[PDB]
Design a protein around this ligand. Structure first.
Ligand SMILES: [Zn+2]
Ligand SMILES: [Zn+2]
Length: 52
């Protein structure tokens, strides 16, 4: 999910201002903490606006 400065963590299914985003999955996302632990190993991108 995305907005011009908002995003989601598809692991929290809550909003984030900075996400890791799977370009494999259908616009799947992870906040920093989830990316750091949930070990999503796929071809991603990152969009960030506050806590990169
Ligand atoms: Zn993925
Ligand atoms: Zn998360």
């Amino acid at each position: 999910g995305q907005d011009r400065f908002v995003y989601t963590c598809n692991e929290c299914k809550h909003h984030v201002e900075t996400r890791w985003h799977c370009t494999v999955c259908e616009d799947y996302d992870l906040c920093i903490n989830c990316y750091n632990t949930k070990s999503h190993t796929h071809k991603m991108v990152k969009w960030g606006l506050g806590l990169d």
